[PDB]
Amino acid sequence: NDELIKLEKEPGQWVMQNKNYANTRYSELNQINTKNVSRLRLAWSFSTGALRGHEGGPLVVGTTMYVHSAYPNHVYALDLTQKPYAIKWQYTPVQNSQAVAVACCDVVNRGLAYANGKIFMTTLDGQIIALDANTGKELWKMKHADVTKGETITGAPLVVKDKVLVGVSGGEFGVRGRVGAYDINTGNRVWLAYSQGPDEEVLLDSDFNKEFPQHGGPGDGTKTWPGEQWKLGGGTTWGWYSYDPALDLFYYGTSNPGTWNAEQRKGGDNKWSCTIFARRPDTGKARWAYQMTPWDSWDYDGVNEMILPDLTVKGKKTPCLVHFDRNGFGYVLDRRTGQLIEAQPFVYVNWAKEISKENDRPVEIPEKRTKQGVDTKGICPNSMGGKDQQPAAFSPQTGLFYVPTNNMCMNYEGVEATYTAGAPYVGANVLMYSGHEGKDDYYGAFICYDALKGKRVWEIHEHFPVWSGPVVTAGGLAFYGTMDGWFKAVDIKTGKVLWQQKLGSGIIGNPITFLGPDKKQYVAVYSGVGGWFGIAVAQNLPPDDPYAGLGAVGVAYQAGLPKATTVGGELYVFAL
Amino acid sequence: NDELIKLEKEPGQWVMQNKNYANTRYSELNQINTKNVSRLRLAWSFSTGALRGHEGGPLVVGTTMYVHSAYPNHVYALDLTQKPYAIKWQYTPVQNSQAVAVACCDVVNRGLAYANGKIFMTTLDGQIIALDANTGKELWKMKHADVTKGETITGAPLVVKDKVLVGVSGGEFGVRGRVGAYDINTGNRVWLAYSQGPDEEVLLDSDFNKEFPQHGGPGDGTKTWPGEQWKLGGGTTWGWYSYDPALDLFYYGTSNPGTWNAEQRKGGDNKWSCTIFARRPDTGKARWAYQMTPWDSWDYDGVNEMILPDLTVKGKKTPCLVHFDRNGFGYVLDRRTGQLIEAQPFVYVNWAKEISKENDRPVEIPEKRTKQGVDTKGICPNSMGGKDQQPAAFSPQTGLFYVPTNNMCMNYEGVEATYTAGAPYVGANVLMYSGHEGKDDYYGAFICYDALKGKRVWEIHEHFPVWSGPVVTAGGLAFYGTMDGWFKAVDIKTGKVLWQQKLGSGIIGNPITFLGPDKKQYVAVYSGVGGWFGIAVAQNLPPDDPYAGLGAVGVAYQAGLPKATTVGGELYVFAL
Ligand SMILES: O=C(O)c1cc(C(=O)O)c2c(n1)C(=O)C(=O)c1cc(C(=O)O)[nH]c1-2
Ligand SMILES: O=C(O)c1cc(C(=O)O)c2c(n1)C(=O)C(=O)c1cc(C(=O)O)[nH]c1-2
Ligand SMILES: [Eu+2]
Ligand SMILES: [Eu+2]
């Protein structure tokens, strides 16, 4: 989108969830820096009017901040000229409350998009809605997903050219994952690209994987599944999307292949679950695709963000795609072709020895592959992954990544799953615990990572999983939150915490930084615990059954999360 | 209670809602003062895990802070030694959700009491519960009120000697108001003192009103009503209680006489609605009582706090009771006998000329007394009163009062009311608007008031009603919050605002100040809009029917409250 290509370069603005189309989450602002961040204090706050998990972050476009909440998905515009703000408008959509019953992993929403004087929001119950950015009035809406089939929407949409791109959730409900594109003016659907099924539904371009046919091709959307299991094939699309206008490609990842009982998917790769897609925004046709986890047996969703840095590879500047997958590997691909440049573990991994550079497939450790009716013990990372949706940041100054991570493992037993539309389609008993097969006393880490070397440059061990995606700045700082409510500023060179404050609820928001109309730098973040690891707190679940929340209940109580935080929903804005 | 008599004098503590048994809301702490308050910043915050109105404030006893929420009445103990706090324990009672439907004025709760290693809480659905202060273990619980009769509890209990004193709400539901006393160790009910009915239920001591028989006597609980209308007589007891151990008297006020249609109560004073009671805590027997508003026709509940200062009256140190009533008069009584020393308006009053010095009765302006089936226009104050429950503060240094006030008026039409147990028993159509018969552009004020002279010293006009009870300190400061979220410190000598910060939701909490284990002074307040004036926001009521919420909906929309604030529930703690 032409306006967005201009706006994303403006240091004071934050016009899409991960700052820019490359998803770097990096700001050139340096008013706040390593020498003065100890003077950071709360400037103002704003209640979202909802409880449970507050993911994503606000947008700042012009002099207006746009704020979004957990279900029922309140949206607000704040006029930042009004000292410190006034509520310019608010909007709450009408929704089918049955959506709450079919959300796997809390009633979260990863936030708004902005383009051409319009705000775009998704709703848990499956709507894409366009609002006038200045008045908050509804311009159009479309039903993109159906809760009666176990579908929800939690992901943030992306505007590319004159289209808004919208995914779906339900990989635990047998949903057919897909991305739909809607005209931003009319709301008319232009295309719909599925993650499995016939080529007619997947949408492949004539040059699909031309350079790397070993990565897959025509027919694989059905032929890599037994019988017609692809009909319940998952590959949902609830993570972060990126875009390279110079290549005319947008990128995203796809979820687990539906049922968690891999026995019922046996015989093939189950493409295109657990896959990185590169697609043409005009037509939705795929130019390339790389499947990270063939025949998944761990719930290693592929949906984490696709950061688009230009890195020096073998002494050559290369347009890359960098992705820290749930499966524990940090992938570096050539974003033109899907060539695998590097893949190394960014957390402790024991389900695979490595990703082979001979065939770009995991070299599996057979004893860690799950099966039906037999428990598999001590798999790392667990299903919540090396990291979950919480997005990493990239500094073009240092050339390094700043990555929120999990340090957890699990036992996982497949069981036969039966499909009933609108009900869970899982088929696993999962018990989760701390890292290195229950040897560690901490459950998260914030790291600095060199993607091409596969090296953790430094690490901050965190008691809880780090479920907050950092913002990194030219001031030499990374900001992130913890699940017991600490908001922290770290020196990116040293890994030292320079400033921190305890907020009212666990932080699963991704902080932003922006300039107000006063030309002053602010840092803003949502507080309000929830998401998958926080589900015991968000949904008030007892400790009696540790298998509940598909393993999340047991591990949260072991980590002490219910003793560490309450639910909330608050936007906090800091300044010097 | 002897422990509390000692604890209330310790500057670093805040062991009952209004600081001490005299309800002065005054702290001797002077670390924070007029010279340095500009350096006040947020230290930490804590989400209460609830939305809607957050009234009262936290307690600080030893190194533990006790926090309470709106329905469903979450209670927390925060260990303040844990840098800055850890959650020591939490408790949430099981409640009958039917309580929500019979709450007149939002699902608020005015807070906890502490005594003898126990925390005492009330619940909306009518329970009084004792918890172990160190572990949160439930020790006993008793049913005090019955939601099936339209009774709820919103008031904070008071511990006196070995008894916890508990009131009831339901003056809009034909409830018989009363105070009950429960043994703090066993929970056994000791006595129950009604606000109307026969003497055996009202509980009169042999010296009741001995010095002032003109204030009423034996039999008036039935004789001052037509027929048996006292059986639906209101006089509920949802405000703040005070205690003088030297006199062995506790004090409180009583609500409106039930139906808002005065025609159905015609013929007498309707005692003891709208009354100040002084009772013996051992037996519940009344030593004196003074009815402020005989045969009420405005819903001027008498429940506002009974502050117990020692004032110099004609050169003589005198034990007084000072009360800023809903009816707009600031009363000063001798707290030994109920003698009226002074009564003058603290807001604009047009329903009465004065309180008669001959017989201590309002000299009414007949055109402003309401009637059945005909509107009465331009009554000031309106039913929300000169001030509502939000408690005033007293400084023993200045001898003056610091009072949050409303600036509003109304039209009020009586309507025939029919009683159905559990359903509303109102009988009025009320429209509310700004002060001075709709001429003013502001709806509130924070004032300094000289009670004996009967004069305002200074006033801060506030756009919204001030629904937050100030804390006043030896540092020369008053702290209070506004309904659009501003927390403010003002110079008590002049009313100048010295410091302010915009919080996430309108403030209807009463701030406190205390010393942490670090020996630093903190100021704490709840944010989370609601209560009667905030009901349009808390209950999400539309503007199309301005009569809704007993008139509160129309006036909130006209003042712009729904455009100024969202719902929330957060504790904010500030320090230098
Ligand atoms: O397969 C799916 O459709 C799907 C959807 C979502 C979601 O929509 O939040 C999550 C997951 N899977 C998932 O596997 C997961 O670990 C997860 C964590 C969270 C969260 O917000 O904390 N959502 C989701
Ligand atoms: O008559 C009653 O029993 C009763 C109860 C309550 C309550 O329980 O909060 C209020 C009132 N009356 C009332 O008249 C009133 O103006 C009021 C304001 C509020 C509030 O918390 O903002 N409660 C109440
Ligand atoms: Eu999944
Ligand atoms: Eu009342």
Amino acid identity for residue A248 in this structure: D
Instruction: Name every chain B residue with its beta carbon within 8 A of the beta carbon of A58.
Output: none
Nearest to A15 by CA among A112, A84, A155: A112
Dist. CA B206–CA B197, nearest whole Å: 17
Q: How many helices (H) and strands (E) does chain B have?
A: 7, 38
CATH topology of domain B1-576: Methanol Dehydrogenase; Chain A (2.140.10)
Which tokens in the block code for residue A409?
A: 């493992």
Contact status of A45 with chain B (Cβ, < 8 Å): yes
Nearest to A292 by CA among A267, A273, A308: A273
Dist. CA B322–CA B343, nearest whole Å: 10
Of B151, B172, B360, B388, the active-site residue reads: B172
Of A73, A209, A256, A304, the active-site residue reads: A256
Annotated binding site of A for pyrroloquinoline quinone: 110, 154, 169-171, 236, 238, 326, 467, 532
Which tokens in the block code for residue A122?
A: 């998704």
Q: Does ligand 1 lie within 6 Å of residue A569's CB atom?
A: no
Dist. CA A286–CA A206, nearest whole Å: 9
Q: Do the beta carbons of residue A296 and residue A263 sit within 8 Å? A: no
Nearest residue (by CA) to ligand 2, atom 20, is B531
**B502 to A44: CB separation less than 8 angstroms, yes or no:** yes
Q: Does ligand 2 lie within 6 Å of residue B172's CB atom?
A: yes
Q: Do the beta carbons of residue B344 and residue B373 sit within 8 Å? A: no
DSSP E strands in B380-463: the ranges are: 393-395, 400-406, 408-414, 428-434, 444-450, 455-462
Amino acid identity for residue A5 in this structure: I
**Segment (H or E) for A17:** none
Dist. CA B255–CA B276, nearest whole Å: 10
Dist. CA A47–CA A528, nearest whole Å: 10
Nearest to A157 by CA among A206, A100, A119, A201: A119
Q: Is A413 a catalytic residue?
A: no
Q: DSSP letter string over A88-122? A: EEEE-----GGGGGG-SS-S-----EEETTEEEEE
Q: Residue B287 — φ and ψ, nearest 5°?
A: -90, -35
Q: Do the beta carbons of residue A280 and residue A247 sit within 8 Å? A: no
Q: Which three-class secondary structure state does DSSP give residue B214? A: helix
DSSP letter, residue A234: B
Dist. CA A113–CA A508, nearest whole Å: 19
Q: Is B256 a catalytic residue?
A: yes
**A569 to B568: CB separation less than 8 angstroms, yes or no:** yes
Using H for helix, E for strand and C for coil, what is the string for A130-191?
Answer: EEECCCCCEEEEEECCCHHHCCECCCCCEEECCEEEECCECCCCCCECEEEEEECCCCCEEE
Residue holding tokens 């009900």?
A423
DSSP letter, residue B260: S
**B571 to A504: CB separation less than 8 angstroms, yes or no:** yes
Amino acid identity for residue B195 in this structure: S
Dist. CA B292–CA B304, nearest whole Å: 12
Q: How far is CA B357 from CA A90, A526, B363, in A?
A: 54, 59, 10
At a CB cut-off of 8 Å and minimum separation 6, what does B203 contact? B191, B193, B194, B279, B283, B284, B285, B286
Nearest residue (by CA) to ligand 1, atom 23, is A105
**B87 to A563: CB separation less than 8 angstroms, yes or no:** yes
Q: What is the number of other CB atoms lying within 10 angstroms of the CB of residue A268? A: 17
Contact status of A76 with chain B (Cβ, < 8 Å): yes
Burial (0-12, 13-18, 19+ Cβ within 10 Å), B317: exposed
Q: How far is CA B153 from CA A184, A208, B266, B448, in A?
A: 52, 68, 29, 31
Dist. CA B377–CA B395, nearest whole Å: 38
Which tokens in the block code for residue A114?
A: 């902005």
Distance in Å, CA B289 to ligand 2 centroid: 21
Q: Do the beta carbons of residue B145 and residue B168 sit within 8 Å? A: yes
Q: Do the beta carbons of residue B222 and residue B271 sit within 8 Å? A: no
Ligand 1 atom with the smallest distance to the CA of A110 is 21
Contact status of B569 with chain A (Cβ, < 8 Å): yes
A242-244/B486-491 β-pairing: unpaired
Which tokens in the block code for residue A177?
A: 């994952």
Q: How far is CA A232 from CA A170, A236, A265, B557, in A?
A: 10, 11, 10, 50
The angle at the Cα of B327, spanning B340 to B70, to the nearest 5 degrees, equals: 115
Amino acid identity for residue A130 in this structure: A
Dist. CA A127–CA A144, nearest whole Å: 5
Asked whether the CA dihedral A399, A403, A408, A411 is positive or negative, the reply is: negative
**Segment (H or E) for A535:** helix A535-538
Question: A85, A502, A561, A576: best mutation site toward chain B, by most B Cβ within 10 Å?
Answer: A502
Using H for helix, E for strand and C for coil, what is the string for A461-481?
Answer: EECCCCCCCCEEECCCEEEEE
The angle at the Cα of B528, spanning B539 to B508, to the nearest 5 degrees, equals: 100
Q: Which residues of B324-362 are buried (b: 16+ CB within 10 A; e: fewer)?
A: bbbbbbbbbbbbbbbbbbbbbbbbbbbbbeebeeeebbb
Q: How far is CA A375 from CA A417, A429, A431, B227, in A?
A: 16, 8, 10, 77
Ligand 1 atom with the smallest distance to the CA of A238 is 8
Residue holding tokens 């070397």?
A453
Dist. CA A388–CA A400, nearest whole Å: 19
Which tokens in the block code for residue B218?
A: 């034996």
DSSP letter, residue B262: G
**A501 to B569: CB separation less than 8 angstroms, yes or no:** no
Q: Do the beta carbons of residue B470 and residue B487 sit within 8 Å? A: no
Resolution in units of Å: 1.4
**A504 to B41: CB separation less than 8 angstroms, yes or no:** no
Report the residue from A76, A502, A566 with minimal CB separation from B48.
Answer: A566
Q: What is the number of other CB atoms lying within 10 angstroms of the CB of residue A397? A: 13
Contact status of A44 with chain B (Cβ, < 8 Å): yes
Asked whether the CA dihedral B457, B460, B463, B467 is positive or negative, the reply is: negative
Q: How far is CA A239 from CA A18, A175, A329, in A?
A: 11, 15, 17
Asked whether the CA dihedral B417, B422, B423, B428 is positive or negative, the reply is: positive
DSSP letter, residue B307: B
Residue holding tokens 């039966």?
A418
Dist. CA A527–CA A56, nearest whole Å: 11
Q: How far is CA B97 from CA B111, B120, B123, B192, in A?
A: 19, 21, 11, 26
In a mutational test of the pocket of ligand 2, which residue from B73, B178, B238 has the highest number of ligand atoms less than 8 Å from its CB? B238
Instruction: Name every chain A residue with its beta carbon within 8 A of the beta carbon of B567.
Output: 47, 49
Question: A566, A567, A576: best mutation site toward chain B, by most B Cβ within 10 Å?
Answer: A566
Q: Residue B550 — φ and ψ, nearest 5°?
A: 55, 35
Q: DSSP letter string over A326-375? A: TTSEEEEEETTT--EEEEEESS---SEEEE-TTTSSEEE-GGGS-BBTBE
Which tokens in the block code for residue A216?
A: 């897959």
At a CB cut-off of 8 Å and minimum separation 6, what does A52 contact? A70, A71, A106, A107, A108, A528, A530, A538, A539, A567, A569
Residue holding tokens 């701390």?
A434
Q: Which three-class secondary structure state does DSSP give residue A435? A: helix
Dist. CA A256–CA A234, nearest whole Å: 6
Q: Is B261 a catalytic residue?
A: no
Report the residue from B49, B74, B505 with minimal CB separation from A47.
Answer: B505
Burial (0-12, 13-18, 19+ Cβ within 10 Å), A37: buried
Asked whether the CA dihedral B361, B366, B367, B371 is positive or negative, the reply is: positive
DSSP letter, residue B381: S
Q: What is the number of other CB atoms lying within 10 angstroms of the CB of residue B226? A: 13
Q: Do the beta carbons of residue A245 and residue A310 sit within 8 Å? A: no
- Measured between its terminal Cα atoms, the distance across chain A in Å is 34
**A41 to B42: CB separation less than 8 angstroms, yes or no:** yes
